[PDB]
Enzyme design. Structure first.
Site, PDB file in Angstrom:
ATOM      1  CB  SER A  39      -1.147   0.311   0.913  1.00  0.00           C
ATOM      2  OG  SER A  39      -2.175  -0.886   0.994  1.00  0.00           O
ATOM      3  CE  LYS A  50      -4.724   1.665  -0.666  1.00  0.00           C
ATOM      4  NZ  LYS A  50      -3.371   0.307  -0.690  1.00  0.00           N
ATOM      5  CB  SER A  69      -4.625   0.616   3.944  1.00  0.00           C
ATOM      6  OG  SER A  69      -3.425   0.670   3.350  1.00  0.00           O
ATOM      7  CD1 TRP A 111       0.357  -7.046   5.764  1.00  0.00           C
ATOM      8  CD2 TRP A 111      -0.607  -5.675   7.485  1.00  0.00           C
ATOM      9  NE1 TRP A 111       0.458  -7.507   6.952  1.00  0.00           N
ATOM     10  CE2 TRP A 111      -0.198  -7.085   7.548  1.00  0.00           C
ATOM     11  CE3 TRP A 111      -1.075  -5.267   8.304  1.00  0.00           C
ATOM     12  CZ2 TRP A 111      -1.314  -7.866   9.282  1.00  0.00           C
ATOM     13  CZ3 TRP A 111      -1.769  -5.799   9.455  1.00  0.00           C
ATOM     14  CH2 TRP A 111      -1.286  -6.837   9.810  1.00  0.00           C
ATOM     15  NE  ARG A 171       1.745  -1.784   9.229  1.00  0.00           N
ATOM     16  CZ  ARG A 171       1.261  -1.653   8.470  1.00  0.00           C
ATOM     17  NH1 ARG A 171       0.828  -2.164   7.265  1.00  0.00           N
ATOM     18  NH2 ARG A 171      -1.124  -1.019   8.798  1.00  0.00           N
TER      19      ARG A 171
HETATM   20  B1  LIG Z   1      -2.037  -2.735   1.945  1.00  0.00           B
HETATM   21  O1  LIG Z   1      -0.691  -2.654   1.782  1.00  0.00           O
HETATM   22  O2  LIG Z   1      -2.014  -1.165   3.980  1.00  0.00           O
HETATM   23  C1  LIG Z   1      -2.975  -3.662   1.286  1.00  0.00           C
HETATM   24  C2  LIG Z   1      -3.484  -3.022   1.967  1.00  0.00           C
HETATM   25  C3  LIG Z   1      -5.236  -4.485   1.626  1.00  0.00           C
HETATM   26  C4  LIG Z   1      -5.400  -5.984   0.656  1.00  0.00           C
HETATM   27  C5  LIG Z   1      -3.182  -5.463   0.822  1.00  0.00           C
HETATM   28  C6  LIG Z   1      -3.169  -6.912   0.039  1.00  0.00           C
HETATM   29  O3  LIG Z   1      -1.760  -7.625   0.324  1.00  0.00           O
HETATM   30  N1  LIG Z   1      -3.711  -7.886  -0.985  1.00  0.00           N
HETATM   31  C7  LIG Z   1      -3.085  -8.909  -1.144  1.00  0.00           C
HETATM   32  C8  LIG Z   1      -3.789 -10.360  -1.419  1.00  0.00           C
HETATM   33  C9  LIG Z   1      -4.047 -10.839  -2.860  1.00  0.00           C
HETATM   34  C10 LIG Z   1      -3.615 -12.456  -3.594  1.00  0.00           C
HETATM   35  C11 LIG Z   1      -3.624 -12.957  -2.060  1.00  0.00           C
HETATM   36  O4  LIG Z   1      -4.120 -11.422  -0.858  1.00  0.00           O
HETATM   37  C12 LIG Z   1      -2.710  -4.539   0.789  1.00  0.00           C
END
Ligand SMILES: *[B]([O])([O])C1=[C][C]=[C]C(C(=O)[N][C]C2=[C][C]=[C]O2)=[C]1
Length: 244
Positions: A50, A53, A97, A190, A230
């Site tokens: 994220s 973004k 996010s 994340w 974090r």
């Molecule tokens: B971000 O880093 O805040 C973030 C928010 C929501 C979802 C994700 C993500 O990493 N989704 C991955 C997903 C695709 C296949 C399996 O899981 C990141």
């Protein structure tokens, strides 16, 4: 008046206590300093997750694919978190996010335009592959913690290749903490769809007097840790170094 030896030990311990391996890179002017309990992470590559973004928003606004006040409709389908089952601005989506908003924005921009803006900005390894809507989550796009802090330094100082006004708009989206006249602008990351999972908090501190101190925390998220470790570690480190 604290020895640097003691700053080093105190910061390593914030990572030790969360039972993870991580690094935080601080930039004072042109000088980069690495802290944490896993210093060699500093120049390894991870998905930006994220943290992307911020670039995604810069690209979308600059290329007239959304406005700061445009409301992205929830389509009514169930979402991974109920906080996402609502209509929102890019700003709101940034705080929450909310990936499906940002995937909407990615789709509007399109694979071709996305590839060219990402080569143009020289972000990480600059490769987005063929999937316009998950390249920042599962690869092939990767960036190091050094590059991440240098990207934050650029945004903080308006040096990226986007209109000044685009940069100010994305920066208004990023304010997450006010602490004694200092403001912390940053975006969390994340990497949920990758093994092991990466966690990021990338931004800068804007001090009482206008000095801006960019930083990038990078750690491994372990089975059931929460997101706010974090932030907590970033804030402990920043205070420990007297930055906030
Ligand atoms: B971000 O880093 O805040 C973030 C928010 C929501 C979802 C994700 C993500 O990493 N989704 C991955 C997903 C695709 C296949 C399996 O899981 C990141």
């Amino acid at each position: 008046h604290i020895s640097s030896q003691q700053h080093e030990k105190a910061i390593k311990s914030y990572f030790d206590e969360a039972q993870t391996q991580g690094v935080i890179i601080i930039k004072e002017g042109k000088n980069l300093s690495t802290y944490g309990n896993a210093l060699a992470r500093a120049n390894k590559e991870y998905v930006p997750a994220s943290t992307f973004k911020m670039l995604n928003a810069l690209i979308g606004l600059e290329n007239h694919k959304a406005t700061t006040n445009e409301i992205f409709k929830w389509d009514g389908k169930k979402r991974t978190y109920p906080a996402w089952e609502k209509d929102m601005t890019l700003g709101e989506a940034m705080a929450l996010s909310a990936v499906p908003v940002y995937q909407e924005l990615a789709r509007r921009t399109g694979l071709e335009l996305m590839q060219k803006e990402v080569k143009r900005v020289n972000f990480g390894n600059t490769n987005i592959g063929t999937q316009v809507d998950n390249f920042w989550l599962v690869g092939p796009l990767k960036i190091t913690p050094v590059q991440e802090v240098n990207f934050a330094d650029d945004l903080a100082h308006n040096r990226l290749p986007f209109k000044l006004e685009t940069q100010e708009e994305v920066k208004k989206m990023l304010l997450i903490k006010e602490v004694n006249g200092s403001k912390i602008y940053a975006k969390s990351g994340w990497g949920m769809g990758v093994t092991p999972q990466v966690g990021w908090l990338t931004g800068w501190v804007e001090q009482a007097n206008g000095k801006k101190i960019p930083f990038s925390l990078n750690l491994e998220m372990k089975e059931g840790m929460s997101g706010s470790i974090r932030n907590e570690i970033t804030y402990k480190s920043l205070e420990n170094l007297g930055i906030i």
